[PDB]
Design a protein around this ligand. Sequence first.
Ligand SMILES: *[C@@H]1O[C@H](CO)[C@@H](O[C@@H]2O[C@H](CO)[C@@H](O[C@@H]3O[C@H](CO)[C@@H](O)[C@H](O)[C@@H]3O)[C@H](O)[C@H]2NC(C)=O)[C@H](O)[C@H]1NC(C)=O
Ligand SMILES: *[C@@H]1O[C@H](CO)[C@@H](O[C@@H]2O[C@H](CO)[C@@H](O[C@@H]3O[C@H](CO)[C@@H](O)[C@H](O)[C@@H]3O)[C@H](O)[C@H]2NC(C)=O)[C@H](O)[C@H]1NC(C)=O
Ligand SMILES: *[C@@H]1O[C@H](CO)[C@@H](O)[C@H](O)[C@H]1NC(C)=O
Ligand SMILES: *[C@@H]1O[C@H](CO)[C@@H](O)[C@H](O)[C@H]1NC(C)=O
Ligand SMILES: *[C@@H]1O[C@H](CO)[C@@H](O)[C@H](O)[C@H]1NC(C)=O
Ligand SMILES: *[C@@H]1O[C@H](CO)[C@@H](O)[C@H](O)[C@H]1NC(C)=O
Ligand SMILES: *[C@@H]1O[C@H](CO)[C@@H](O)[C@H](O)[C@H]1NC(C)=O
Ligand SMILES: *[C@@H]1O[C@H](CO)[C@@H](O)[C@H](O)[C@H]1NC(C)=O
Ligand SMILES: *[C@@H]1O[C@H](CO)[C@@H](O)[C@H](O)[C@H]1NC(C)=O
Ligand SMILES: *[C@@H]1O[C@H](CO)[C@@H](O)[C@H](O)[C@H]1NC(C)=O
Ligand SMILES: [Ca+2]
Ligand SMILES: [Ca+2]
Ligand SMILES: [Ca+2]
Ligand SMILES: [Ca+2]
Ligand SMILES: [Cl-]
Ligand SMILES: [Cl-]
Ligand SMILES: [Cl-]
Ligand SMILES: [Cl-]
Ligand SMILES: [Cl-]
Ligand SMILES: [Cl-]
Ligand SMILES: [Cl-]
Ligand SMILES: [Cl-]
Ligand SMILES: [Cl-]
Ligand SMILES: [Cl-]
Ligand SMILES: [Cu+2]
Ligand SMILES: [Cu+2]
Ligand SMILES: [Mg+2]
Ligand SMILES: [Mg+2]
Ligand SMILES: [Mg+2]
Ligand SMILES: [Mg+2]
Ligand SMILES: [Mg+2]
Ligand SMILES: [Mg+2]
Ligand SMILES: [Mg+2]
Ligand SMILES: [Mg+2]
Ligand SMILES: [Mg+2]
Ligand SMILES: [Mg+2]
Lengths: 737, 737
Amino acid sequence: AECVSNENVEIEAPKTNIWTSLAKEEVQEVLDLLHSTYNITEVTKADFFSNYVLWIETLKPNKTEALTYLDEDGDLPPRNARTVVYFGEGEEGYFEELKVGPLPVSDETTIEPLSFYNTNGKSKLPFEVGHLDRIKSAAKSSFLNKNLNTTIMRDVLEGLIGVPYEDMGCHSAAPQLHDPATGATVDYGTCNINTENDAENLVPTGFFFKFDMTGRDVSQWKMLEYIYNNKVYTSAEELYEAMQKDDFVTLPKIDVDNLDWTVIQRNDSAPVRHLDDRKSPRLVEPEGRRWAYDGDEEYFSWMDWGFYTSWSRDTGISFYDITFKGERIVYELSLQELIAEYGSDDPFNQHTFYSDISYGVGNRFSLVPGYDCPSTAGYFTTDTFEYDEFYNRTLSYCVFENQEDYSLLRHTGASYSAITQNPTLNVRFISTIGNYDYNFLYKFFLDGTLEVSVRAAGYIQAGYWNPETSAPYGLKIHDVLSGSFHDHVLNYKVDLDVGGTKNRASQYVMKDVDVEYPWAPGTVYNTKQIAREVFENEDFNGINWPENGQGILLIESAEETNSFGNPRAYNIMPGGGGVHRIVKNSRSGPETQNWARSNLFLTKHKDTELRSSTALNTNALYDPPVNFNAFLDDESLDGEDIVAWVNLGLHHLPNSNDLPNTIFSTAHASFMLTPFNYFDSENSRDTTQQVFYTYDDETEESNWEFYGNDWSSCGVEVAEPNFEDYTYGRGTRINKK
Amino acid sequence: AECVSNENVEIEAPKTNIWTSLAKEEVQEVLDLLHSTYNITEVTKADFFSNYVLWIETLKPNKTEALTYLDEDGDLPPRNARTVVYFGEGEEGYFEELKVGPLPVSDETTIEPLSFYNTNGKSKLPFEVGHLDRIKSAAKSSFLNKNLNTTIMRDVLEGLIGVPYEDMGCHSAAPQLHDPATGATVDYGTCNINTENDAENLVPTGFFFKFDMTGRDVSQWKMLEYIYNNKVYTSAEELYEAMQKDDFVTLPKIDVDNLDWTVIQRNDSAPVRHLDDRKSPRLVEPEGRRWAYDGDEEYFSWMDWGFYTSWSRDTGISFYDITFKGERIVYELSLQELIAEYGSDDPFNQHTFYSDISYGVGNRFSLVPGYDCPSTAGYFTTDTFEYDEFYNRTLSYCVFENQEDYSLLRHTGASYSAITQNPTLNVRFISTIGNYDYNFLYKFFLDGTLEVSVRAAGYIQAGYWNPETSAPYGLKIHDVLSGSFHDHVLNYKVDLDVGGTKNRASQYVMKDVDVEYPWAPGTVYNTKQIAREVFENEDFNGINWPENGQGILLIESAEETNSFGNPRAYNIMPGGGGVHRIVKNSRSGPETQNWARSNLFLTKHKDTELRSSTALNTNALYDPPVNFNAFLDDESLDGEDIVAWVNLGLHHLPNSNDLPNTIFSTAHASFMLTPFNYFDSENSRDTTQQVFYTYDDETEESNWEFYGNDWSSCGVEVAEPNFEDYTYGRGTRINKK
Ligand SMILES: *[C@@H]1O[C@H](CO)[C@@H](O[C@@H]2O[C@H](CO)[C@@H](O[C@@H]3O[C@H](CO)[C@@H](O)[C@H](O)[C@@H]3O)[C@H](O)[C@H]2NC(C)=O)[C@H](O)[C@H]1NC(C)=O
Ligand SMILES: *[C@@H]1O[C@H](CO)[C@@H](O[C@@H]2O[C@H](CO)[C@@H](O[C@@H]3O[C@H](CO)[C@@H](O)[C@H](O)[C@@H]3O)[C@H](O)[C@H]2NC(C)=O)[C@H](O)[C@H]1NC(C)=O
Ligand SMILES: *[C@@H]1O[C@H](CO)[C@@H](O)[C@H](O)[C@H]1NC(C)=O
Ligand SMILES: *[C@@H]1O[C@H](CO)[C@@H](O)[C@H](O)[C@H]1NC(C)=O
Ligand SMILES: *[C@@H]1O[C@H](CO)[C@@H](O)[C@H](O)[C@H]1NC(C)=O
Ligand SMILES: *[C@@H]1O[C@H](CO)[C@@H](O)[C@H](O)[C@H]1NC(C)=O
Ligand SMILES: *[C@@H]1O[C@H](CO)[C@@H](O)[C@H](O)[C@H]1NC(C)=O
Ligand SMILES: *[C@@H]1O[C@H](CO)[C@@H](O)[C@H](O)[C@H]1NC(C)=O
Ligand SMILES: *[C@@H]1O[C@H](CO)[C@@H](O)[C@H](O)[C@H]1NC(C)=O
Ligand SMILES: *[C@@H]1O[C@H](CO)[C@@H](O)[C@H](O)[C@H]1NC(C)=O
Ligand SMILES: [Ca+2]
Ligand SMILES: [Ca+2]
Ligand SMILES: [Ca+2]
Ligand SMILES: [Ca+2]
Ligand SMILES: [Cl-]
Ligand SMILES: [Cl-]
Ligand SMILES: [Cl-]
Ligand SMILES: [Cl-]
Ligand SMILES: [Cl-]
Ligand SMILES: [Cl-]
Ligand SMILES: [Cl-]
Ligand SMILES: [Cl-]
Ligand SMILES: [Cl-]
Ligand SMILES: [Cl-]
Ligand SMILES: [Cu+2]
Ligand SMILES: [Cu+2]
Ligand SMILES: [Mg+2]
Ligand SMILES: [Mg+2]
Ligand SMILES: [Mg+2]
Ligand SMILES: [Mg+2]
Ligand SMILES: [Mg+2]
Ligand SMILES: [Mg+2]
Ligand SMILES: [Mg+2]
Ligand SMILES: [Mg+2]
Ligand SMILES: [Mg+2]
Ligand SMILES: [Mg+2]
């Protein structure tokens, strides 16, 4: 017979999602007010001397006002926007962050400089250290074409590289290099062979350059150097003349006629593996979906968990008010930043230290149904605003229930077997940022554990292989290609509030010790002990996971205990990828990413310490809007609202197993938040997704208790995914405007 | 319409499984020959002065003869049995290992002392350090009853504990403590309250004792001490008299009337979570099974992988001749040992250092269909022989194809999206050894990566909570219960043969370094580099995973390279649980478990270094059959057949989340073996389980390429698991005898 079908369930959220992105109408009201207050130019007509709007987004509520609303019948917090506007109308240009609110627009609405979350106390970001925005990108591109497409440079480039200028693409290293001592801003760059399949990163040419881009007048910008085979030339003419001499060394050129090694998808001439003409397995829901949601509030419930989601252009998804069995465990869980920091012999890769939130993690592409998420997933639409357009992104994140490949627990003994299944709620989004594809997963378990993970895939940023200098910095993975060495590091703000806001952070340290026991006087034993140590103060050094795993890190309630006197706690448990930066002192990130140097940091919660990086950090090398180290000022954590800033990372040394692409299976990092004396007992025991088998010794009869789950054979339709809902591109745009 | 069904596929193995367990007929021939050669007593009639047979199993072939057979058209290696026989007919008793072969029995068959794989050079294990076999267990049990069930001790026990002798169970700590300097063998013990649900480990009484069990004449065995509240009494009478004094302290007694906190299975009075009245998700195979097997040879194929399995009483499953795309990567992969080493204030837990292979990992229970493995799993029968009976164990291990919850790789760019699914082959067995349930998984990926993992669940071995002394060694997790601190450590023999047997082991060390580049003279940069270092010699210290993950460990072919000159290699990549023992010098395991002190060891392959522990190790504290450290003798590894002995572990400090049972989700350890320059490229690209989506900019049309996989909706039957095949117990026995 047919399996019993049930419909998807919707619920009403306990409260309003006060963290949600601005509605289209709210964005429009703000943009309209900006246009009536200032002389705003459309981005498509703008230059460095115009004013124009970049960003308009929710300025999220402060925590005390949010908690009063959620927990104590408080007023809705004010609805405010953060906007970022470039002002070029003055003697000097700058970006300024402005607060617009409250909303909706009324006679109470104002526009004010906004800086409370910037540790440097400034609303204004100087032009020299400005955002690499559409206007600056276009200016740089035009400048490079002006220099590289001369009669002489066309000849130089074709001579060295083997293809004409039209067949390559030249571009600039990030971040830019502004020197506050001299005022100069310089930048390096390289060229890569053009491909039809987005594989430019696998065909770097080894031709480099350096330019001065100081000031808002591009007529004063100048090429400083051309660099090739580790030699520096101070003009096109010098390099051209050097190339005419008999002693000139041209390094091996890329074979542009044979690029099949860069292609990801199956060669349909390839043999099929045995049985690969059968479809692989599918997850199904025989009795329908087991999580519920409020569509308007983006509030989700599953097996006694509840939470709200929010979306930003900078970072993608965040979670607020994460509750389990009716108690908040985490106020805010939010990815903060992702860096990719390269080491190299060459002046492009050695100057690459990406801030992915500067580019945007939340302004990318839809998920591919059936492949990126299981076919049983539900999909959600989010939005952003950039440069005069509201972007609606369908299939932006997905929610699905997995059946994990192992049971949650079991035991066999005393003539019974008791086994509990392990269904999990899963929230995923994937951000493809140029060459990289980052896969973010949040996995919730029946006992109250949550696992946060990331996997990376996509094309690597390789480098040109110069046998004389490249070997310390990468493996030779193709004829003229190095797998350039880099660190990925990701910061998560984990605002645990265990048994209320007032908490303590502690560690149980494990050690071997020699002891004598009262029951064997005089006999020394080498044994092992625990010792609880309280993290009394913010530690500038952060916390690194202990050698040989010899410690357990807790966030404890300051006052609440379980029935046996233990502080209610959650354990922050590292999984794979518990690594931080190798490099200590980067010229490409002196002060911009100071959270990335230890595994984790504990701080006192502050509304002014909203975020560990900003989209405005990356080029502001010495005076970024947020210098994370400002948070670390030795404050007591001993009965305080604590935030853990937890890092995941990978030291990536690409090899053959990264061509044509890196794989997600071995590029993985995760951590868990797991109850530790948070209850009196383990709290999955109430699930019905378990079996109790008993055997009677006398009667020789077995009994199976399935707790209302009928495992009898039944028929289902294995449904086609919603492929028709997937359209390529970075969201549907509506110009405002 | 209905999904297209296909039948399970069977294949013929390339060769015979020369590692397989003895057939019933082979065991019978050996037992018959032992009975005709020696005076053998049935185990049920045996004592310490009898001779009797314990074990009869395959003595696996040596490696060179195996490889000649597999690869070079060699003869089948000789078919031999290892037997272990207790001989008590002499002046002193001992166990002896004997080789019986070749088989089948003929005039060529002999019986010889067997010791080549014992580093101590002995076939004979003295009685004092003997196996804790059925005969010795029975003698100890009888001795304890003789002492503890006297009129005086019945009164002492009821007075201190609160229930009569009939309502408790008293038992001995493992290992025993034999002192070679004096010849004495002693042992500690405790008592636990009897339960109906195998939860005795949650109700330890805090009553301890110590006895001398030296020699084969039990009439000379003597109780030495009773220990209670950290006080030592040298007789029952002394303790009884102390208990009559007004100043005697009786510690708080267990509440035996309220033990519901020990119960695993659902309380059907408990509320149901929202939507838990719907069945959780199921994995299905819409087009049938995609792995094949040879049922007689226990040879398995999946997506270009091949391997044979073997089963032993000591360790469970092993893998031989693991091939990927027609090349052997691993000759032998075999779990070797699992230890559980406790630290405590009390003389039971402090003297607990289990060797789980002494008890047997491969002589346990069947898997529960649908719960222990997915419903799409296939199940396999294995066998053992112990104490006159051949045991056939159905549902002993399972094989299934998972769909992992994340794709293997993807990329979006240049108007396409390319995503590859991540189906994996999975081989599981579960060994429930008393209180512990160990879940072993071997997971194979499309690119040639394999992941080895373990998860633990079941009841903890807790201890009595004495407020005066217990706190350094555990948390108070119930009214009179400590979560005793312990290490789990597991050893795997990983005989990688990368591009042949002759290999090198290397590490790429990662470090930050200050450098000056030729293209910026005089400017110092702090960057990062790699350096390849060869492990030239066996290192007595072993290898511990590097701080901050700053290294990659390889097994390289000595001679074979890929097309870019890199040695073909596999990377041994740690996942979670990359920990080793905390304790350094245990009185309960001085020389018996010397592999457990570092994360991994590399040695030169030897047939005499078959195994890192034995079932005969645990009580032989100073002179075990195998002392692992004997393998570490500074031999060159620089172009040699290398074996990696890889450890997984957990430092377990039980908390509330371990009552009533530990959970598998957070008690996890794993490592991966992943290709590293082993090919020229990443080798999943030929799978059909991928999609290539393209978008045409001009025509505004999308195209989907599914490589022959039809995702159209189709009907399937979701089948009932084979629950009828699950019978409780540790295998069906046939007495031989
Ligand atoms: C959320 O909490 C933040 C941080 O406590 C609040 O920040 C405060 O915002 C006000 C403006 O609304 C700032 O006042 C301004 O200060 C400048 C500089 O002295 C002064 O010139 C202006 O006239 C104005 O008074 C205030 O400095 C700032 N506090 C901090 C510590 O930076 C914010 O108001 C809170 N948000 C909401 C919605 O309540
Ligand atoms: C597999 O390899 C092992 C290790 O190389 C071989 O072990 C050898 O086994 C023979 C017995 O079959 C041992 O010979 C005996 O030595 C004793 C002691 O000196 C002697 O008294 C006996 O008369 C006999 O010669 C030999 O010592 C042992 N080698 C080592 C290094 O321990 C084993 O034979 C191989 N198995 C197969 C099936 O070929
Ligand atoms: C607005 O700025 C533009 C130049 O960006 C200028 O031409 C125009 O006069 C300004 N508008 C007003 C009303 O002054
Ligand atoms: C580069 O110069 C060539 C001729 O010298 C011209 O045809 C082409 O349009 C130029 N490219 C760009 C992008 O300006
Ligand atoms: C496809 O396979 C053919 C034949 O093996 C090979 O020559 C070619 O390089 C492959 N093409 C691509 C695009 O991968
Ligand atoms: C965003 O997309 C959703 C789903 O298609 C739709 O309901 C909503 O109206 C869209 N918003 C706008 C203003 O386009
Ligand atoms: C075998 O041993 C038993 C004692 O275990 C003894 O009674 C018997 O005489 C022995 N058999 C022979 C044939 O000597
Ligand atoms: C213990 O002694 C009691 C009486 O003193 C007796 O009834 C019981 O059978 C004894 N138990 C055992 C296991 O010998
Ligand atoms: C079952 O639930 C009842 C009511 O909550 C409780 O009193 C009892 O202790 C539970 N029993 C078991 C066996 O867990
Ligand atoms: C072991 O069990 C399998 C499967 O039930 C069966 O085919 C085989 O005959 C059994 N072996 C013996 C000798 O009982
Ligand atoms: Ca907090
Ligand atoms: Ca602080
Ligand atoms: Ca080897
Ligand atoms: Ca050696
Ligand atoms: Cl300012
Ligand atoms: Cl090339
Ligand atoms: Cl949906
Ligand atoms: Cl302590
Ligand atoms: Cl700066
Ligand atoms: Cl011997
Ligand atoms: Cl109790
Ligand atoms: Cl089966
Ligand atoms: Cl090197
Ligand atoms: Cl010994
Ligand atoms: Cu990478
Ligand atoms: Cu444990
Ligand atoms: Mg909205
Ligand atoms: Mg009011
Ligand atoms: Mg208002
Ligand atoms: Mg509503
Ligand atoms: Mg506060
Ligand atoms: Mg067999
Ligand atoms: Mg012959
Ligand atoms: Mg023969
Ligand atoms: Mg056959
Ligand atoms: Mg050899």
